[PDB]
Design a protein around this ligand. Sequence first.
Ligand SMILES: Cc1cc2nc3c(=O)[nH]c(=O)nc-3n(C[C@H](O)[C@H](O)[C@H](O)COP(=O)(O)O)c2cc1C
Ligand code: SF4
Lengths: 56, 429
Amino acid sequence: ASATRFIQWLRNWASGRDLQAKLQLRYQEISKRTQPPPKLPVGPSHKLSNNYYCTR
Amino acid sequence: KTSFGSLKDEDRIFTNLYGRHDWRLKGAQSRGDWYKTKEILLKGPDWILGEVKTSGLRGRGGAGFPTGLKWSFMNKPSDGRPKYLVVNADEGEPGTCKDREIIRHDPHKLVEGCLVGGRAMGARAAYIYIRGEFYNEASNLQVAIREAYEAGLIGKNACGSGYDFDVFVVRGAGAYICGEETALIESIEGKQGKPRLKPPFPADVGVFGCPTTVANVETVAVSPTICRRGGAWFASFGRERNSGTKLFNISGHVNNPCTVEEEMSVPLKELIEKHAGGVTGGWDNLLAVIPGGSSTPLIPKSVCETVLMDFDALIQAQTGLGTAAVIVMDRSTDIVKAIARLIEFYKHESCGQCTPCREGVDWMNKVMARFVRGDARPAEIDSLWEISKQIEGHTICALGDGAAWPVQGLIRHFRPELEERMQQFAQQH
Ligand SMILES: Cc1cc2nc3c(=O)[nH]c(=O)nc-3n(C[C@H](O)[C@H](O)[C@H](O)COP(=O)(O)O)c2cc1C
Ligand code: SF4
């Protein structure tokens, strides 16, 4: 991302692609390394009634 | 007949129910007790069992088995062991206090009932098991028994009939479970009142390991009058297969709570109004009725309008006649709390022997405590229903069923009240 305008033009022309739109190196677009806690859902056997094991 | 009720005084059996006549032998004889007892005994066990059979009498202790057939299990030859009659005077079902009146006001009816019932079974003696709290009543019974012994009506050559018969009174020590017939026997044998599994049946292996029949106080005490007046006289009262007269206890939210003798199949509404003075605050103030002791499911006012008071009619209403203890709850009642207290009762009375009642009833009690406060989720109502079905039919004795049925009655008829209680709690918190 720090490449000068001339170098961007040079390596774009050499490759034939717009390399600046799809850089191999990751910058700020990645997910934050700290996330809010999850709260995961429970399966279909998490019931208080009509749930005898012999039926499932 | 199609209408039942309005029993006439001449057709009542317990004619000293209220203790306004001499309860001792002289008074008892003037009222017809101990009359032609010798002729009854000499008629033979087969004749006595036939008269009780034709009477259509059914057990008055709560379960209602045909009495004549039940007592016929004993009518079998000797095999060396003594045979006994055990009279169940434990009288422990909440709401039920009928057997108390028989013992203290009509003891000689019970004593004669033991002898006649004892003869039909071939039993050498009768043990009357009476709850420990009934101290004064037991002392009355002992006095009557001594009068019978002195008059030669019981004991050696009882009533001059050549039949030897003793009557012993044994007191309990505080346990509802000892009303259960096998737990009663275990208690007499000096053990914890824990019911036995069946088989064997008491008619094969009973008290002291000998043939026994356990009969309710009311069942035994009406037998001498049935033999005197005939089985057909008894069967003329009540519906078919619901024969006879019955002692009813009307308690709770009625104007004049009382014990009364009435015909079987009398309408529940008629019984409450004619004898108990009606529901407190008027009939329309009625909420629910427990028709036959705390072990029978409640029924709402709508069911109570037309339901008859007998075994078959109440089974059709998804409940039971039980002991015929009518507990009335008006609309001021906290129905959820009232049932929760009965579950607390069964939790205190469970003998703890077998897993589903030892652990299940205590579990139901904890859930009901939260349901009283609304401190639960609606999904727990179906869970509580399912828990009660895992107790019912899986325990050693019927106390487990007796704790499951009241819960089922509440959920069946008052689920909206349970859900409303939960909504209120959640909004507040
Ligand atoms: C928990 C429990 C308590 C009982 N309490 C009594 C009782 O107090 N009096 C009684 O006669 N039967 C009681 N029974 C019923 C007896 O076990 C038995 O069915 C009855 O004594 C049989 O007598 P019957 O045929 O004359 O009704 C109780 C049963 C259970 C399960
Ligand atoms: S059901 Fe309850 S009272 Fe009956 S044997 Fe089991 S634990 Fe004891």
